[PDB]
Amino acid sequence: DTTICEPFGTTTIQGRYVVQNNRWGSTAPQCVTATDTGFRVTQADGSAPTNGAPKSYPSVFNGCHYTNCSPGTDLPVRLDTVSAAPSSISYGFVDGAVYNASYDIWLDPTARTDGVNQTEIMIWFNRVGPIQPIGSPVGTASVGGRTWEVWSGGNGSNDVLSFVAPSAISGWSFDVMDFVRATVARGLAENDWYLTSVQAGFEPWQNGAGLAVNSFSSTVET
Amino acid sequence: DTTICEPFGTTTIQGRYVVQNNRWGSTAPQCVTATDTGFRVTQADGSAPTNGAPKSYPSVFNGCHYTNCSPGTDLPVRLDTVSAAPSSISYGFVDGAVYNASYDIWLDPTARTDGVNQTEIMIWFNRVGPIQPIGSPVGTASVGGRTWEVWSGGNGSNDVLSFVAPSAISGWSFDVMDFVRATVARGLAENDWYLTSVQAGFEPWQNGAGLAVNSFSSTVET
């Protein structure tokens, strides 16, 4: 295991994914501990107002996030060359934090390895507390066999389309291209765009220690 | 509950799906009992050689199968009008039968309510015994977040593309359009074809009593 408390510290797991503390929105201590198959939040002090941004987005990812590219990633990859982009996750939840458990999937018109990507897809697997996605609710959508409430809006530097689960999903295996297709269908990407990263972790607003990504996988079939 | 032993007997469940005994390939008694959410095989005598056709395909379906259309089905529906075709299943398996647990998804160029449909997609959720799909193995494919061995061939009256699970899947929720897209990608359908039925059940070669479809759902989002 590797513990990271530096706000912008990262490490690699399984020779392929990057674990990032990513404590961009808080000044109180936060640490993650990378394990063989994922990571756990081992400290997450402080509270951010629930009507604003979260404290951070501790997470694990395949792909390129602001110059940081996981070892041997196939991303960024052009979407029309992808037959499938399967991803799986096992989340560990705890009862005394205000947070969401979410994937952040980034798409762009260029093979972006750095800088803000054009469109962000968010998949909320769990939500505890009076928090809500960026933008406003636009109705439901069936993606991957499950029903989601969809939100769309612009978070500042870019567009964000969120798919929110009705109740907690602690583990799932799915094709990231299903959500990409739903995004293309809403006019926020095109088929010849690039998938630049697939990330999963938590956005905590209050506490967060104990939350974990027990396992994660993300590949691309071309 | 409703018991059906007539070879070609059917009934409806939940006001929307058809349960069919469909004992087309055996002369020995076979009965199914339709329940509130699915059906069970309650008798399935006889054995068919494992290098040939199975005895039958007792199953539940949404759509139109040889003139028999489930109550209020949205099928046949044109594929380019479908945003999603979610389906879910809970299978009950037993240890002394030779069989597969499979979905049969039929596609055609016309809004077919009767007669042989052009292309059949088979999804094998479980396989017990020395049986194999129609045709020959053509490699693997990731569909819906899971990995499948794919087979293709022509069964007599039409083309068949099968996706076989590596080990038993007792319950899953998925989008039938993911498999349709993989079929379109292999040249066995086109995007403006029709989805004419989504069926799930078992193909038994030896015994089969005790096998069940505990629950099934199949809808189309347009």
DSSP state of A128: E
CA distance B46 to chain A (A): 36
Q: Which of B100, B88, B94, B103 is nearest to B42 (CA)?
A: B94
Among candidates B84, B145, B175 on the partner chain, residue whose Cβ is nearest the Cβ of A173: B145
Active-site annotation holds for B203: yes
Neighbouring CB atoms inside 10 A of B65's CB total 23
The answer to whether B204 touches B47, Cβ cutoff 8 Å, is no
Q: Exposed/middle/buried for A132, CB within 10 Å: 0-12, 13-18, 19+?
A: middle
The answer to whether A69 touches A106, Cβ cutoff 8 Å, is no
Q: Which of A108, A178, A101 is nearest to A142 (CA)?
A: A178
β-pairing verdict for B136-143 and B119-128? unpaired
Q: Which of B181, B80, B176 is nearest to B123 (CA)?
A: B176
Give ∠ CA A154-A41-A172 in degrees, rounded to 5. 65
The answer to whether B133 touches B122, Cβ cutoff 8 Å, is yes
Q: Which domains, ranges and CATH numbers included, belong to chain B?
A: 1-222 (2.60.120.180)
**Chain B residues touching A178 at Cβ < 8 A:** 144, 175, 178
Neighbouring CB atoms inside 10 A of A157's CB total 11
Mutate to test the interface with A, among B83, B123, B138, B142 (most CBs of A within 10 A): B142
- Interchain proximity A142–B87, CB inside 8 Å: no
- Interchain proximity B178–A174, CB inside 8 Å: no
CA distance A42 to A30: 7
CA distance A173 to B182: 18
Rg of the Cα atoms in chain B:
16
Mutate to test the interface with A, among B146, B167, B179 (most CBs of A within 10 A): B146
- Interchain proximity B144–A145, CB inside 8 Å: yes
- Interchain proximity B143–A172, CB inside 8 Å: no
Give the phi and the psi of residue B44 in degrees, each rounded to 5. Answer: -155, 70
β-pairing verdict for B146-154 and B136-143? antiparallel
A101, β-bridge pairs: A126, A202
Q: Exposed/middle/buried for A148, CB within 10 Å: 0-12, 13-18, 19+?
A: buried
A120 CB contacts (<8 Å, ≥6 apart)?
A: A104, A105, A106, A107, A155, A158, A159, A160, A161
CA distance B63 to A209: 49
Provide the total of helices (H) and of strands (E) in chain B, helices listed first. 1, 17
**Chain B residues touching A186 at Cβ < 8 A:** none
DSSP codes of every residue in A94-106: -SS-EEEEEEEEE
The answer to whether B150 touches B141, Cβ cutoff 8 Å, is yes
Question: One of B149, B190, B203, B221 is an active-site residue; which one?
Answer: B203
CA distance A108 to A197: 10
Amino acid at B55: K
Tokens of B108: 């055609």
A62, β-bridge pairs: A198
CA distance A121 to B130: 44
Cα–Cα separations (whole angstroms), residue A103 to A185, A197, B132: 19, 10, 38
Cα–Cα separations (whole angstroms), residue B164 to B81, B104, B168, B217: 28, 12, 10, 21
CA distance B202 to B102: 6
Active-site annotation holds for A120: yes
The answer to whether B188 touches B14, Cβ cutoff 8 Å, is no
CA distance B104 to A195: 33
Q: Which of A58, A72, A47, A62 is nearest to A9 (CA)?
A: A58
Among candidates B174, B182, B185 on the partner chain, residue whose Cβ is nearest the Cβ of A144: B174
A185 CB contacts (<8 Å, ≥6 apart)?
A: B83
Three-state SS at B141: strand
Neighbouring CB atoms inside 10 A of B134's CB total 18
Cα–Cα separations (whole angstroms), residue A104 to A11, A176, B100: 18, 11, 38
- Interchain proximity B86–A173, CB inside 8 Å: no
Most distant CA atoms of chain A, gap in Å: 44
**Chain B residues touching A84 at Cβ < 8 A:** 141-143
Mutate to test the interface with B, among A138, A172, A173 (most CBs of B within 10 A): A173
CA distance A96 to A186: 36
- Residue B60 Cα to chain centre, angstroms: 8
The residue assigned the tokens 């952040």 is A104
Give ∠ CA A50-A48-A138 in degrees, rounded to 5. 30
The residue assigned the tokens 């069964």 is B155
B51 CB contacts (<8 Å, ≥6 apart)?
A: none
CA distance A78 to B73: 38
Polymer length in residues for chain B: 222
CA distance A15 to chain B (A): 21
Residue B190 Ramachandran class (φ > 0 left, ψ -120 to 50 alpha, else beta)? beta
